[PDB]
From a paper:
Here we show that the same σ–(c-di-GMP)–anti-σ switch has been co-opted during evolution to regulate distinct biological functions in unicellular and filamentous bacteria, controlling type IV pilus production in the genus Rubrobacter and the differentiation of reproductive hyphae into spores in Streptomyces. Moreover, we show that the anti-σ likely originated as a homodimer and evolved to become a monomer through an intragenic duplication event.
Thus, to elucidate how a single-motif homodimeric RsiG interacts with c-di-GMP and its partner WhiG protein, we solved the crystal structure of the R. radiotolerans (Rr) RsiG bound to c-di-GMP and Rr WhiG to 2.93-Å resolution. The R. radiotolerans complex contains one WhiGRr molecule, a c-di-GMP dimer, and a RsiGRr homodimer. In the complex, the RsiGRr forms the same antiparallel coiled-coil homodimer as observed in the apo RsiGRr structures. Because no c-di-GMP was added prior to crystallization, the c-di-GMP molecules seen in the Rr (RsiG)2–(c-di-GMP)2–WhiG structure copurified with the complex from the E. coli expression system. The bound c-di-GMP dimer is coordinated by two RsiGRr E(X)3S(X)2R(X)3Q(X)3D repeat motifs, with the same arrangement of contacts as observed in the Sv RsiG–(c-di-GMP)2–WhiG structure, but again, in this case each motif is provided by each subunit of the RsiGRr homodimer. However, in contrast to the S. venezuelae structure, which shows no contacts from the WhiG σ4 domain to c-di-GMP, the WhiGRr σ4 domain makes extensive contacts to the c-di-GMP. In addition, the Rr RsiG homodimeric coiled-coil, though similar to the coiled-coil in the RsiGSv monomer, lacks the long interfacing loop seen in RsiGSv. The Rr (RsiG)2–(c-di-GMP)2–WhiG structure revealed how sequence-identical regions of the two RsiG subunits can flexibly adopt different conformations, allowing them to interact with distinct WhiGRr σ2 and σ4 domains.
Author numbering:
A (entry chain T): 28 to 101
B (entry chain D): 23 to 99
The structure:
Amino acid sequence: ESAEEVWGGTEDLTSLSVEELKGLLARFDEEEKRISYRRRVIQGRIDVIRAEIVRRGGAVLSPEELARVLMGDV
Amino acid sequence: TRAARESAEEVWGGTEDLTSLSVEELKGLLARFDEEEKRISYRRRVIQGRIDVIRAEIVRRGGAVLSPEELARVLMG
Ligand SMILES: Nc1nc2c(ncn2[C@@H]2O[C@@H]3COP(=O)(O)O[C@H]4[C@@H](O)[C@H](n5cnc6c(=O)[nH]c(N)nc65)O[C@@H]4COP(=O)(O)O[C@H]3[C@H]2O)c(=O)[nH]1
Ligand SMILES: Nc1nc2c(ncn2[C@@H]2O[C@@H]3COP(=O)(O)O[C@H]4[C@@H](O)[C@H](n5cnc6c(=O)[nH]c(N)nc65)O[C@@H]4COP(=O)(O)O[C@H]3[C@H]2O)c(=O)[nH]1
């Protein structure tokens, strides 16, 4: 929370100390871990939604075809 | 890879069986999902942009200093 604002008024980084950067880094890292996770998940759910469109209906996908779809070829 | 799944109470919130959705609805869901995907990938970009900037500054001055002793224990067990 305090990370979003301090990073906006801190202007340049030398004004901070190392043990303060370790703090900004920590609270910005996991926010990136879960935003990237949430990203890859919905990105994968899009490849199966688009793949579903071309299989015309209730396409149950064998573990064989899921690999192809998840790479990008839906 | 675990903390994300815990706070991911909204990523699998009201999801539906994609093999049950009708062809018409799939296109309607593709639109909604395509908009959040492009919005989370931007916030992702600007965020990881900060991280690289702050990680560079740290390494520049003090850095990830880890005494060869403690580091050995990390690699050992
Ligand atoms: N449906 C779907 N969409 C996807 C997938 N992966 C990425 N996208 C979306 O489409 C764009 C992908 O561009 P790219 O040609 O992979 O081009 C990417 C890629 O070249 C690079 N990039 C971003 N993150 C990474 C990463 O973690 N690793 C690598 N190697 N390149 C990355 O930055 C470019 C722009 O990324 P963004 O701004 O996020 O823009 C991304 C994102 O909005 C996927 O598997 N499925
Ligand atoms: N072509 C393409 N491939 C993609 C894209 N998004 C993800 N990938 C692939 O999927 C892997 C996992 O990405 P993640 O789970 O978001 O995990 C990512 C993400 O969390 C993070 N990352 C990616 N780019 C940056 C960056 O510029 N700064 C920081 N701090 N982290 C980054 O590190 C991991 C990157 O791992 P990579 O070795 O790049 O490995 C990436 C890359 O191989 C994309 O848009 N386009």
